[PDB]
Amino acid sequence: GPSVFLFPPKPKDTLMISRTPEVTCVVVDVSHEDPEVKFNWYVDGVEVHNAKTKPREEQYNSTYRVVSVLTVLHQDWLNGKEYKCKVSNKALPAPIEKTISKAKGQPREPQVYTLPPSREEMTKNQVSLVCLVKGFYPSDIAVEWESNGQPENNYKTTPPVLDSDGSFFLYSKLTVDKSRWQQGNVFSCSVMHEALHNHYTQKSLSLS
């Protein structure tokens, strides 16, 4: 029978006022004989009516994928409101219900520190500029890098790790040619998190 999977907005979309956060009810294993799906949506128990159904997609295993998308307000999501999707279908003896929301728990401001390459890394062709982000809750976060108004894309960021005080930390490492570092260039770590002033901080880093 059909199965339902419900996904939160992308952290960034909830955090950038200039973007459009949405929750997404994905229904798989829809039979050819009964492709009709009904969606009911609830925000804290109260039914809303403004969802839109995405175009039906045929799956190479003879089933349909049906998706309903609900747009939401930045503050509603960040206030921890609960979003419920309810799926009815003839191949489904009883309606399936799913709920998500932001992780419950007092939000905590991340502390952002940049760390220059080890004196021991200075021998190599490339160097690691590190951004440590610690003391944040919930774990929803965006980390990016830049120099001179342009994104630096050659970085990798760790998954969030639960720390012994109940908050999270991560590290992000950008790899640059040693010369680019020697050349005095200033590099920036951009972090977006709900509990920061204006949901945004930036820490810079250069050879001294």
């Binding site: 950038m16 006022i17 200039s18 830049e146 108004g149 951009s190 002033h197 204006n198 949901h199």
Partner: peptide
């Protein structure tokens, strides 16, 4: 005040 990210508006209090 307002924060921006690569020219794009993040948030204003």
């Amino acid at each position: 005040d307002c924060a921006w990210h690569l020219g794009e508006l993040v948030w204003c209090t």
